[PDB]
């Protein structure tokens, strides 16, 4: 017998999910696991040093990763990078230099997110001073910080637009940043205020849809966000609650806390009872399943403490993720379907997402 | 009392506690560095039943300490209230934003 | 031969430290790291130098060298860690020793995962 | 309140120990975890990236560790060094450049070590052909490869000599290095056979008196190496075990896994039953305590399924070590006493070590 390496993953693509392990008690070995959500099994991992974020690139083809260096770890000189690594030999291919600003975090998606013309990968920087950071991957280059975000957090890409992505700011209205080939700002647009930041702050992670985002606050309502036209139009709020949930003190929870299946229009939620100031990261109690338009409750099934979330539309699926083990769901009826369980997928992950499939 | 999650001053801590690894609640573990920066929270005091505001300065340039890790999110707030929020990491403007710990410093009386 | 053939036998049995060939592994086995027995998991590389010694397999009744190849270069897998210690000696018998990383002579030495390569007859 | 930092350890150097966390799980981010053994409180640590080594210098004043750096961790040039740090501050000060051969491996003792006199470290290489390496620590400086040692392994420094030290060679004889005061070779020796390598291997970890070291077994017997004249003379084996001991199958295991308590003789050894081939890094079923001058043992106690020690001469302690937990033992009188357990004091550890208080 002979050792030999260069081998690829031995599942195909459509197979595969990814874990983001931050290994929070040991932050410097951050991880992307590879699994195969069909069965459970580890198919391989890519190392992300220090608090490392990922995306897979929108053809299916790349790993992109984010991460800080430092020339002895815990001193000498910073680099701030994005890597691109080959989806099906999980091998590092570029690095692309970044300012040393990129956001250090909790995996929420929308720190580290791309075009969905894919020719753009948009991340969020903090300095403290916030500004968005764009990458041109044909180039391998930053191109410039997004100013105009500032005092805003986290990109919401436009998936019915090349280029374009909003920001949600701190006037509790949304930015929206519409990108020339260069990737430099080609225009932009400020929505009216959406939800009052004092008073019923929302939740970043979005439910995004082709062309509109709904967003769950702190207290259970819903706010939205319409992309259609050629300005951001915003509404809201509406109660995720009726007068029994109302009664019990039900609330929102968790981290990649909601998700929309788009072809039916059912929004996912995580939530729990006895809410209070302080309980807006529980874990989830539950997960409801909502009706966007007709804006009812379809169904309530139990949370097995779950934080994050990820939908795949093209197969139908919800993943949720407690922070160590992955539970794999059909969504393709009203109320979901528990598939299988994967137990000790991470040791501290808040982010899963399959590997892309179609989506064009 | 100091090294629970529970005690009053903790109320948005979201690291490891400082004063469990060979710090205090306000000072940084040796060769660990302050950051200049940090979230702030607003905590409830149980004897005199005032609000305080507490800053949440890490201690960095250490690798993770590993003890005493709590996630209390007492009027804590998302990243477009940057300085309210605590799923980042304050360390993140310091030379080495390596995160080592979590102090609670008791700024005044909110 | 199935006892000589892991990629032919229960996934279970192979991933297990007692499989009969893990005789002398200190790691973690590259079967459940997204390799196989006798491959390193994607993005990894073989280590060219390594800790050998024999194993008995139960199965056939024989004895045979086995080689305790690492693969280097990306972090620790984490998974089916295993400690066993058959035959093996210490450092001033260094080929016979599993104290230490066998990735250490790689352009990587990150240790990712250890396995067993048949080799022969002992 | 003002949050400072420049601290030094909030405990009296005579208090301190030294767990060497290997964090196998993620050796990337090994590091020393230092305790007050008194009270077992947490008193700082010491970041050593990939399993990392440490000692502290014999005049108490420094922390050296050995560690090896990548630019990109998993990839890019690689830098073994040793550094220096500051005991009391915890701080780093210099790097002092290695070739990129320093052993990676578990944490036994005599991988890196140091003169007597503390002017020089001395640690092992593996390329994987070995040589022991010579950092002279004023100068900052690898000063000397001692090529000689091929085919030898690890480090066991003469107490009664400033410069020398002993390895054990693939010959089961030892070999004698003598430093100069530049800290290259100014003599050596190589003493008889002392132990049959193929029929009788032994533990490479010493029980280590002023002018002579004892060695067990995988069997259960003992070598003793007489350093008192320039030559060392060897000898053994005498038995650790009784007719009643072979009955069931006692033998030694662990990995730091001997003791020796100079004012009295005695060794301190791990033991378990049931021994064959295979055991020899057994958990210890018991601590036996011999006496090297009558070669007899004179207690035993519970093992607490420890698998390292080290002795404090001048407060008569023993700690043990089973790889997460440190039990302190006074050993004033033959009969050790267990005076308290320090959970959690590493995840992965095999080493643990006194802040020394002798001086040199
Ligand atoms: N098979 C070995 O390469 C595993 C191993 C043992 C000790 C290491 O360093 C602490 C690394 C890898
Ligand atoms: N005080 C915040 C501690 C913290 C939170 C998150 C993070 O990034 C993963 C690092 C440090």
Redesign the interface.
Known sequence: ?????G????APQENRIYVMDS???????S?VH?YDYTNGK??????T???GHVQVSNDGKKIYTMT?????????K?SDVVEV?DA?????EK?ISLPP?R????N?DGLFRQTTDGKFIVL?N???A?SIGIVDVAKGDYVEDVTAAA????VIPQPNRPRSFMT???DGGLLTINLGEDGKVASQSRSKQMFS?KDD????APALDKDKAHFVSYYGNVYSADFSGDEVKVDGPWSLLNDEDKAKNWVPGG?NLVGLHRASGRMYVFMHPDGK?????FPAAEIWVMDTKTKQRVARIPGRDALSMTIDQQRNLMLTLDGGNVNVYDISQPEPKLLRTIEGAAEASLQVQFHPVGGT | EVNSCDYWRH?AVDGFLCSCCGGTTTTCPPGSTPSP?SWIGTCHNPHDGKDYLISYHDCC????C?RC?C?????????????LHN???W???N?????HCTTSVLVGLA
């Not at chain 1, 017998?1 to 390496?5: D, H, N, Q, R, S």
């Not at chain 1, 290994?23 to 070995?29: D, I, K, Q, W």
């Not at chain 1, 702050?201 to 970043?204: G, K």
Request: with cysteine; charged share 20%; proline share 4%.
């Open positions: 017998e002979v050792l030999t390496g081998h690829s993953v031995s290994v929070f008690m040991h932050l410097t070995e991880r590879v580890f198919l391989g991992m890519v190392p040093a220090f608090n800080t260096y430092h020339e002895r770890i815990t001193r000498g910073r690594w099906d030999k999980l091998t590092f690095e600003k956001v250090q975090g909790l929420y969020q903090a300095s403290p916030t005092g805003c957090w986290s949600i700011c701190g930041v702050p929302i939740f970043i981290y100031e302080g309980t807006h990261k | 109320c920066i340039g250490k690798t993770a590993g890790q996630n209390t999110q007492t009027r804590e707030r998302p990243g477009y209230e940057f300085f799923d980042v990491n360390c993140m403007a030379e080495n934003s390596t995160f």
